[PDB]
């Protein structure tokens, strides 16, 4: 029923644009929306990847590997899945494995790759692939893993037991000023609910 009529640029930065979207509602009436988009999306099937990194080690419980970073939009530290934009010509799986190694030092193995999923569809067109990666914590390559942060990247690694992830995130929130990412929190909720 509904579809886009026009997209009028309002403001274009180096990294983000604001657009006036005109669309048809299902009563057949024209309406508008203020839509955010990134300037960085070329041919990619999504803007970015988030990595669900499952650290597996003999005689350890499986951990989920998370990163803590200062996020200027938030004015604060945030706990998120390892994540980055897809380079032009890069696959989602390549991007995921590269961002995981850059942000954590860990060398993962692809397990699965989502279709493009929407970050905040009432605000932005922004999409990711959610890529599940296993990390063989028994491999010597993954022994004392060194982050390789790019210019202006500063990442802390936090590995939390999958079997207690939600209470471990609650304990971190209830111990300092920091926001858990909605996707990390949804994943931790589902681990409890299953």
Ligand X SMILES: Fc1cnc2[nH]ccc2c1
Annotated binding residues, as ranges? 15, 33-34, 38, 71, 83, 85, 99, 103, 120, 153
- Binder of its own copies out of 51, 52, 66, 100 (CB under 8 A): 52
Return the number of the residue (123 or 190) whose C-beta is nearest ligand X. Answer: 123
Helix axes 182-193, 165-173, angle to 10 degrees: 140
Question: Which span (90-98, 99-107, 108-116, 138-146) binds its own copies, by CB under 8 A?
Answer: 108-116
Q: Which residue spans within 63-154 are E strands per DSSP?
A: 63-71, 76-80, 83-85, 108-113, 117-118, 127-136
User: Could you give the CA distance from residue 162 to residue 103 in angstroms, rounded to a whole number?
Assistant: 20
Asked if 102 interacts with Mg ion (CB under 5 A), we say yes
55 lies in the binding site for Cl ion (CB under 5 A): no
Does 146 bind its own copies (CB under 8 A)? Our answer is no
Does 40 participate in binding its own copies (rule CB under 8 A)?
A: no
Measured distance CA(66)–CA(55) in Å, rounded: 11
């Amino acid at each position: 029923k509904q579809y886009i009529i026009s997209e009028e640029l309002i403001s274009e930065g180096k990294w983000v644009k604001l657009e006036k979207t005109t669309y048809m509602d299902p009563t057949g009436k024209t309406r508008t929306w203020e839509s955010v988009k990134r300037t960085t999306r070329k041919e990619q099937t999504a803007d970015g990847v988030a990595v669900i990194p499952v650290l597996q080690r003999t005689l350890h419980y499986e951990c989920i590997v998370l990163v803590k970073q200062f996020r200027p939009p938030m004015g604060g530290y945030c706990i998120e899945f390892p994540a980055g934009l897809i380079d032009d010509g890069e696959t989602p799986e390549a991007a995921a494995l590269r961002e995981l190694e850059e942000e954590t030092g860990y060398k993962g193995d692809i397990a699965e790759c989502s279709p493009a999923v929407c970050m905040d569809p009432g605000l932005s067109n922004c999409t990711i692939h959610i890529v599940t990666v296993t990390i063989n914590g028994d491999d010597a390559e993954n022994a004392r893993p060194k982050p390789k942060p790019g210019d202006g990247e500063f990442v802390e690694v936090i590995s939390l037991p999958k079997n207690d992830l939600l209470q471990r995130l609650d304990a971190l929130v209830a111990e300092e000023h920091l926001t858990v990412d909605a996707r990390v929190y949804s994943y931790a909720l589902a681990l409890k609910h299953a």
